[PDB]
Design a protein around this motif. Structure first.
Motif, PDB file in Angstrom:
ATOM      1  N   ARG A  56       0.826  -1.200   0.000  1.00 44.41           N
ATOM      2  CA  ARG A  56       0.000   0.000   0.000  1.00 44.41           C
ATOM      3  C   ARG A  56       0.866   1.257   0.000  1.00 44.41           C
ATOM      4  N   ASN A  57       0.685   2.094  -1.016  1.00 46.08           N
ATOM      5  CA  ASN A  57       1.450   3.330  -1.134  1.00 46.08           C
ATOM      6  C   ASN A  57       0.558   4.481  -1.593  1.00 46.08           C
ATOM      7  N   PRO A  58       0.444   5.514  -0.745  1.00 46.26           N
ATOM      8  CA  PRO A  58      -0.374   6.694  -1.042  1.00 46.26           C
ATOM      9  C   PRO A  58       0.222   7.547  -2.156  1.00 46.26           C
ATOM     10  N   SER A  60       2.292   6.167  -4.544  1.00 47.18           N
ATOM     11  CA  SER A  60       2.341   5.327  -5.734  1.00 47.18           C
ATOM     12  C   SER A  60       0.938   5.039  -6.260  1.00 47.18           C
ATOM     13  N   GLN A  61      -0.042   5.059  -5.364  1.00 46.02           N
ATOM     14  CA  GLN A  61      -1.428   4.807  -5.740  1.00 46.02           C
ATOM     15  C   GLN A  61      -1.584   3.422  -6.359  1.00 46.02           C
ATOM     16  N   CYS A  62      -0.646   2.534  -6.052  1.00 46.59           N
ATOM     17  CA  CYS A  62      -0.678   1.174  -6.580  1.00 46.59           C
ATOM     18  C   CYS A  62      -1.441   0.245  -5.641  1.00 46.59           C
TER      19      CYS A  62
END
Length: 89
Positions: A56-58, A60-62
């Motif tokens: 979860r990466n804010p 990266s939005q991945c």
């Protein structure tokens, strides 16, 4: 795809895995393997009951996810990083 695990040379290095369960908390630093993966023995150390860990990466939005095999969590082609992991089972 021009990539095999058999590929191994002398001088291998070993990094660490930095991930957190909650977003409000900070990324905990735990030990890992030399290949880049992480033994299940370490996953239960700070993440008890954690069967599956996602990425979860804010920024990266991945929505990637940590690979799980034989209990050992395999990292991506980029590494572990200091992102937040999601517990799933």
């Amino acid at each position: 795809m021009a990539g095999s695990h058999h590929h191994h040379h002398h001088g291998s290095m070993s990094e660490y895995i930095r991930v957190t369960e909650d977003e409000n908390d900070e990324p905990i630093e735990i030990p890992s393997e030399d290949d880049g993966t992480v033994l299940l023995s370490t996953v239960t150390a700070q993440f008890p009951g954690a069967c599956g860990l996602r990425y979860r990466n804010p920024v990266s939005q991945c929505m990637r996810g940590v690979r799980l095999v034989e209990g050992i969590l395999h990292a991506p082609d980029a590494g572990w990083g200091n992102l937040v992991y999601v517990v799933n089972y």
